Design a protein around this ligand. Sequence first.
Ligand SMILES: [Cu+2]
Ligand SMILES: [Cu+2]
Ligand code: NA
Ligand code: NA
Ligand code: NA
Ligand code: NA
Lengths: 620, 620
Amino acid sequence: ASPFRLASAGEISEVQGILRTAGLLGPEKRIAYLGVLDPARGAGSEAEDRRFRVFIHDVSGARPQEVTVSVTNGTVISAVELDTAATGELPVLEEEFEVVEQLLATDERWLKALAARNLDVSKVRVAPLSAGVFEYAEERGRRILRGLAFVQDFPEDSAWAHPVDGLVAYVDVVSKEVTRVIDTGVFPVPAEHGNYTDPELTGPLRTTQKPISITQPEGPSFTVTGGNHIEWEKWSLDVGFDVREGVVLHNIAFRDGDRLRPIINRASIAEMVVPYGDPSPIRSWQNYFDTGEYLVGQYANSLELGCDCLGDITYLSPVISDAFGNPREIRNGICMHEEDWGILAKHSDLWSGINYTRRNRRMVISFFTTIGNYDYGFYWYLYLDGTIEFEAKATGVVFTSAFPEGGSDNISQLAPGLGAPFHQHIFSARLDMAIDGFTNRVEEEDVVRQTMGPGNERGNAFSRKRTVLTRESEAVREADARTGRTWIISNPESKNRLNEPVGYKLHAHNQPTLLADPGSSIARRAAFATKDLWVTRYADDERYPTGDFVNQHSGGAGLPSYIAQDRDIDGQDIVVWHTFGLTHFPRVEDWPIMPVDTVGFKLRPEGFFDRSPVLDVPAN
Amino acid sequence: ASPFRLASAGEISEVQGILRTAGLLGPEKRIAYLGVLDPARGAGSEAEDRRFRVFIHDVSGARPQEVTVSVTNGTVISAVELDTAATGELPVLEEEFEVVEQLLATDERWLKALAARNLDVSKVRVAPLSAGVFEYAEERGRRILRGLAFVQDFPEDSAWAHPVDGLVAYVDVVSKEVTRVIDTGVFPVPAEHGNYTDPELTGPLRTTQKPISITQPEGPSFTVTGGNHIEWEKWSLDVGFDVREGVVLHNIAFRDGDRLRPIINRASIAEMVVPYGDPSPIRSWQNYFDTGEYLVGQYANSLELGCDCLGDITYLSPVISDAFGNPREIRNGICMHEEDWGILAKHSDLWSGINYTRRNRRMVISFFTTIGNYDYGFYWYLYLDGTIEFEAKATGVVFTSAFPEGGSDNISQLAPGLGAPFHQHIFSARLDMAIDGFTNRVEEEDVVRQTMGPGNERGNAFSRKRTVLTRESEAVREADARTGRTWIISNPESKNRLNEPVGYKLHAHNQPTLLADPGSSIARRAAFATKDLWVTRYADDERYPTGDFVNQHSGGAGLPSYIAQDRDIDGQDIVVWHTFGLTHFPRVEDWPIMPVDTVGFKLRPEGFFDRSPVLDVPAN
Ligand SMILES: [Cu+2]
Ligand SMILES: [Cu+2]
Ligand code: NA
Ligand code: NA
Ligand code: NA
Ligand code: NA
């Protein structure tokens, strides 16, 4: 029924047929991306047209294509040939990861580098990493992955404990040619294992933990209609899944009395970049755009009940396409449940004699992805009181190197001879806002300190100022924790009962933004990451802060290009882009497997309601 | 057995006897504070001496006394007469709160002010508030409370909805004299009620919430020995209770292999101040020192099972003394339980084929206090991975005023004619550190950005710097979110296996500190609140950031006086004082009862362990 429904296997199968009959899916073609398009603005006509966007790669080296097809009609709407040296290469293909280790195993330079280290080539795993854009002129227009080596002592060994430093290779994965092998010298391969399931490492397992049992004897409070539509505790929304972005939230609304009031049209993590801060040439090119280059949705885990998600769990199993257009189900890839969240409101009044306590709860929508050594959980939360929160959970195994004798200013030591380069994990949330409708504006709110003197005789006053961002050219903002800076998204045409515009306040964590030198390649390709908040006027084709083709793209695309239009954003259809991230100096406690660390942001109502929206919560 | 055991009713009763026989507790005496003293440094002799500190007030106006007694021996160790104009008045007495409303009801100026507003004096509640120190010379040496009025329409009415603005009175509660009545003009008393249990306000209660059941079929994982000693998941600590500070944590340690390793000797919230930023003379004197002036422990709630604390709950009922020295039990005043806390660590490894997930959990120790219109929850958390976290939860009813026609730069409008003055809630955590013993130091850690150029050819490098704080005069630090500033407390004489000093990293929320003008009375009395971090050398008598007698104290005492000593803190017995707070611009959603908002801080291991300390957690 709904246009925001998850993609079905039958839809995937029809796209494959449409492309194949049109002659766009021969044996040399691979699908590098396949995703449903959202209904265009003006969906108040039920023009039921399910359209899919496809990125098609060519393993013979012919030009790739972007293709839009209509599943509803069975038509190719458009197909354009891409000049990848201009607009960027397509995302990395899963089948390309292994070709690097296979190609390097037969290259004389690589084998000679391994022989100098007395390493059995059968035991050497190569991590295939995105290449970026640097000094090499021969790579422009070519599909390049770079490879770093780790030794696996036996099939169940954790290779991350055994990095082979001073060695990197570059690989053209279309022509199947090792372009360069760089050996800057022999480092001792760290010898200790990092096998966190080996009893000699864990010691005896604890017997002290008693079970915690979380059950819902009458089932959950939320309902799921038509595959992916959620109603819970006055909230209404649709949960989408895209192979690039992962979980996407659509049509976030709140039932206030008889009215369904929109809040957010679309919420997503639209890019995430992991830049490394080690100046060694072996790794100074290392930056993962996990969303844009690898696609985080396609490596989503199957979540185990009682282990990954605990309690009364409702699963969704989203369907994606493989490289040949076959439907592939991610079984139990999304978990949804409600959690108790402590006290919501409490007061004991001396004068009235009334004692009042209410409990809070939250709805949780979550998925997990694994990209090589790292594992990331994406969690969206909705609270009873109207708060919306996002939380990223970072875990897995840290990326390693040798620890150089005499230490390092850019690498932490984890174990004898074993280092962990400094890095960041930086996210971009794209919030297509719809506070009581599409006429929205953003105000930046700073605390204002006041000087002692006339009108403030005791020197106690303080205030706040709000500045409306009116045009995109002024809508590039930095955090200021010292002045308590927040941003308010309001609707100037929808007033509360006090005749104030309704609004929501964005609270950031105020973590450092991108640390690289502003003239670096990564600062140009990840320009969004240099500023905490961007506001653009909505446009169909402005989907990602880094543009559509991030892999080996020279930079400048995405947000810097969008805001150059300098469009009106004062009471208009706007999109907020919030940058937030973790700066990771690895600690000993992160090894051999890293405890979860978290970062996020939240939005709270700011005069959206006419009074507390949780007065009708019953007393438990 | 343990010297850190909670005070017993029998101990309280013995103190009362000791004071009475010594002639220090006649009919004009009130006990304003009574608390156990911690064992002095060098407790490695089991000199079992339970000593109590008592503050004794005199309702005839004679000089008050500070008195230390030994319960173990039955002796008065010392008794000193206080000159309160010099060192400050004693904390407010609960019996003094009501005398203000009673005194004002017979004063001709007050009655005339009420008659001008057509208010029935039987219907007027006076909030009795601490007086502070301002321009009035006649108040020095006197015990003053100031009163603001609210109308209660009927016995169960919420008086906070009906502030009487333009009116304040000052009351000498020893001599029982109304010193001043200030009437700056008639404001309309806001007419809407704020009765959040009235069905005409709530509407029909939700029937959509299904129960969440949290049970532990084998009981909790922690044990409680000798009243208040907790062992849980390698953690060991003692939970104390003081009528001033509330819950105090003692002897926080972690069992690493065979060794019990100390982390924190004593943790407490040692002061909390609520300054108002409204320049109207009716309220420009308003600042609550909830800990120092009112004592948050004595207004602790009894926590209801299934409502305030949910799950398998273990209660402590601490005992305090009333104004006459009788023991008073706070039934179920402290809740302790463990909670599931999501994923602890997760990795799915392509090369090894091993899929690994572990769940996290936390131990929770919490209590709630109510001071007039506000209610505060204090929560301490211990995590499996060595993290320690504090969280304050602020709720209750906002303090109100009239909303002036034509608006205000310092007051929010909540309802027609009803305002809420701007304010902050600022806490001081006092952390008597003991990282692997008492030889500790503090380093301030900033991210360091590096310029593109030689050695950093690609412009990707970044680093960090650490600065040792060596003397108290340099140990007064501000936050810097932009540079990711944190503080590390280390032990330079205890190394991990990589020969690095063991440490813990303090992560602040970087919220604004005290906003008042630096020349204000409140900036002088709450000087701790102007800076995020202080480090002092330990001393027995340096207990509170604001000194021992905060009520009507002219200011300067506490931390500014302590650090003037300029003592060595580089590898010494040190105390960290962390300021953190909420800046509250009230929203419509905060009325008529405020949803919980939170602020806090956390400490994480930083090379304290030789690898992850949760490798031995079993697989659920
Ligand atoms: Cu990391
Ligand atoms: Cu407040
Ligand atoms: Na280009
Ligand atoms: Na919008
Ligand atoms: Na004084
Ligand atoms: Na200490």
